Design an enzyme around this catalytic site. Structure first.
Site, mmCIF file in Angstrom:
data_model
loop_
_atom_site.group_PDB
_atom_site.id
_atom_site.type_symbol
_atom_site.label_atom_id
_atom_site.label_comp_id
_atom_site.label_asym_id
_atom_site.label_seq_id
_atom_site.Cartn_x
_atom_site.Cartn_y
_atom_site.Cartn_z
ATOM 1 N N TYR A 120 -21.952 0.029 2.574
ATOM 2 C CA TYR A 120 -23.343 -0.281 2.253
ATOM 3 C C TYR A 120 -24.115 0.857 1.576
ATOM 4 O O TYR A 120 -24.601 0.694 0.451
ATOM 5 C CB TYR A 120 -24.080 -0.744 3.518
ATOM 6 C CG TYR A 120 -25.535 -1.039 3.262
ATOM 7 C CD1 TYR A 120 -25.948 -2.307 2.876
ATOM 8 C CD2 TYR A 120 -26.498 -0.033 3.391
ATOM 9 C CE1 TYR A 120 -27.284 -2.578 2.630
ATOM 10 C CE2 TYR A 120 -27.833 -0.288 3.132
ATOM 11 C CZ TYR A 120 -28.220 -1.563 2.770
ATOM 12 O OH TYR A 120 -29.538 -1.837 2.514
ATOM 13 N N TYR A 125 -25.812 1.744 -2.711
ATOM 14 C CA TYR A 125 -27.162 2.126 -3.144
ATOM 15 C C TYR A 125 -27.191 3.483 -3.838
ATOM 16 O O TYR A 125 -28.000 3.697 -4.731
ATOM 17 C CB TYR A 125 -28.185 1.988 -1.987
ATOM 18 C CG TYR A 125 -28.317 0.530 -1.637
ATOM 19 C CD1 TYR A 125 -29.271 -0.282 -2.257
ATOM 20 C CD2 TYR A 125 -27.403 -0.070 -0.774
ATOM 21 C CE1 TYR A 125 -29.339 -1.667 -1.970
ATOM 22 C CE2 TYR A 125 -27.454 -1.422 -0.499
ATOM 23 C CZ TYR A 125 -28.423 -2.214 -1.083
ATOM 24 O OH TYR A 125 -28.423 -3.555 -0.790
ATOM 25 N N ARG A 171 -31.981 -4.197 -6.127
ATOM 26 C CA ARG A 171 -31.123 -5.285 -5.653
ATOM 27 C C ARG A 171 -30.193 -5.731 -6.769
ATOM 28 O O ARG A 171 -28.987 -5.885 -6.560
ATOM 29 C CB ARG A 171 -31.933 -6.478 -5.149
ATOM 30 C CG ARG A 171 -32.801 -6.166 -3.962
ATOM 31 C CD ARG A 171 -33.284 -7.457 -3.320
ATOM 32 N NE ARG A 171 -34.010 -7.130 -2.093
ATOM 33 C CZ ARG A 171 -35.318 -6.907 -2.049
ATOM 34 N NH1 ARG A 171 -36.057 -7.014 -3.159
ATOM 35 N NH2 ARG A 171 -35.886 -6.597 -0.887
HETATM 36 C C1 LIG Z 1 -31.848 -5.530 1.572
HETATM 37 N N1 LIG Z 1 -32.033 -4.448 1.174
HETATM 38 C C2 LIG Z 1 -32.102 -3.102 0.628
HETATM 39 C C3 LIG Z 1 -32.487 -3.127 -0.857
HETATM 40 C C4 LIG Z 1 -33.897 -3.661 -1.095
HETATM 41 C C5 LIG Z 1 -34.930 -2.987 -0.190
HETATM 42 C C6 LIG Z 1 -34.494 -3.025 1.274
HETATM 43 C C7 LIG Z 1 -33.134 -2.356 1.456
HETATM 44 FE FE LIG Z 2 -31.405 -7.476 2.125
#
Ligand SMILES: [C-]#[N+]C1CCCCC1
Ligand SMILES: [Fe+3]
Ligand SMILES: [Mg+2]
Ligand SMILES: [Mg+2]
Ligand SMILES: [Mg+2]
Ligand SMILES: [Mg+2]
Ligand SMILES: [Mg+2]
Ligand SMILES: [Mg+2]
Lengths: 212, 192
Positions: A72, A76, A56
């Site tokens: 999104y 990540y 996060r």
């Molecule tokens: C909110 N979110 C994303 C990153 C932390 C774990 C779950 C997926």
């Molecule tokens: Fe979240």
């Protein structure tokens, strides 16, 4: 961290891109989209290289314009890649060599984080609490709209978890705390400028203090 | 300037896989879990059971985790569950304003719209307008309550059971409990 990711209450956005029960398509819209979560889990559960909280936080650490224009799942990809480089598992050179071009990463952290507070209070359902009027430059699971605001406890968790402000930086001093469902009147958070009733925020014990 | 995202994502995979850090079949296994196992059909089953079984309804609302565990639906991002009950005067809605946090195993992975900046910014401050724009009218005599998923609690909404479903089987009831009903932006509808 008072970053651009702390979006609740921000004004000027348009319509949510959905109407109820509309087809959302397949879970993954491209063949790579399962990779960020899967490789997260490889990092967390298989390698023990970082925590979910660190994922996060690394996403929060994207340069603000970069964060705002990145879809999104791509955030990540960037976040997990950044952590792998920061932890010394991968190099940016090898990522860029394999990618065949630029692979800019999240910005370095500007905070070492903070430990789980030694002094906290066990609160009970029905008790009035204030969110500590504190500013934390590193990771924190307190959205700014509730900072310094007063609400009522509707739930104390029967489990405990590491304090995000510590584990989000890979610190050894995150301890464990329960969290509290804190119910705020909409007007407590946004004055007259809200159409809602109440908002319930799930807040770590260390973010709270007795009210009055 | 950035290489195509697919090239970046596969580079990350290949860099790790090439160092022996990703078990064989690992990402493939997760893809299957995300696509096939994590599903709002699970949440729908829980709701339909709560609607027809007062004892289970009470369990679900008092110890969500235990209730979900009975069906075997605990999992990643769904280990501590709280179900929130709609009433004639209360409508619940879930968001993760800070990212996307969602009860994956019982709701499925979040949809693009739920992770949108629009939803994350707006639903906390103007949920009535947001729901209205999305096609759900909430009357002024109903309190809207937004749960922001800021820690480890993972939420599902237990919506009101619509009139016209009296005596329906659990299978029949499950059909009308959609992903959006579980998130809280939709109210279950009786098909024509
Ligand atoms: C909110 N979110 C994303 C990153 C932390 C774990 C779950 C997926
Ligand atoms: Fe979240
Ligand atoms: Mg782009
Ligand atoms: Mg360079
Ligand atoms: Mg292999
Ligand atoms: Mg765990
Ligand atoms: Mg407004
Ligand atoms: Mg029948």
């Amino acid at each position: 961290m008072d970053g651009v990711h702390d979006l609740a209450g921000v004004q000027g956005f348009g319509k949510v891109p959905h109407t109820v029960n509309a087809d959302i398509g397949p879970t993954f819209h491209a063949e790579w989209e399962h990779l960020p979560y899967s490789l997260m889990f490889a990092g967390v559960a298989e390698l023990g290289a970082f925590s979910v909280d660190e994922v996060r936080y690394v996403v929060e650490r994207m340069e603000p314009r970069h964060y705002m224009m990145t879809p999104y799942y791509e955030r990540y990809v960037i976040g997990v890649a950044t952590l792998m480089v920061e932890k010394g598992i991968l190099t940016q050179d090898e990522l860029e060599s394999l990618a065949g071009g630029p692979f800019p990463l999240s910005r370095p952290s500007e905070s070492e984080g903070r430990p789980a507070p030694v002094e906290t209070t066990t609160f009970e359902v029905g008790q009035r609490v204030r969110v500590r009027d504190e500013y934390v430059p590193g990771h924190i699971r307190m959205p700014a709209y509730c900072r310094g605001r007063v609400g009522t406890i509707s739930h104390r968790t029967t489990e405990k978890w590491p304090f995000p402000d510590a584990i989000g930086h890979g610190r050894n001093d995150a301890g464990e705390e329960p969290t509290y469902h804190v119910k705020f009147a909409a007007e407590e958070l946004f004055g007259s400028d809200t159409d809602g009733g109440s908002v319930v925020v799930d807040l770590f014990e260390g973010y709270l203090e007795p009210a009055a | 300037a950035q290489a195509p995202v697919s090239d970046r994502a596969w580079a990350l995979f290949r860099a790790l896989d090439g160092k022996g850090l990703v078990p064989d079949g690992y990402v493939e296994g997760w893809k299957k879990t995300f696509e096939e196992d994590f599903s709002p059909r699970r949440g729908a089953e829980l709701v339909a059971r709560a609607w027809t079984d007062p004892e289970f309804r009470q369990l679900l609302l008092t110890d969500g985790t235990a209730a979900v565990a009975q069906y075997g639906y605990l999992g990643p991002q769904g280990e501590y569950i709280v179900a929130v009950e709609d009433t004639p005067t209360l409508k619940n809605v879930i968001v993760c304003s800070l990212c996307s946090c969602t009860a994956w195993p019982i709701l499925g992975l979040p949809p693009t719209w739920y992770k949108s900046f629009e939803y994350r910014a707006r639903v906390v401050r103007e949920p009535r307008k947001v729901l209205s724009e999305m096609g759900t009218e909430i009357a002024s005599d109903i309190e809207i309550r937004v749960y922001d998923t800021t820690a480890e609690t993972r939420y599902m909404v237990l919506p009101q059971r619509p009139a016209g479903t009296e005596g329906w089987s659990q299978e029949q009831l499950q059909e009308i409990v959609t992903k959006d009903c579980l998130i809280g932006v939709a109210i279950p509808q009786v098909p024509t």
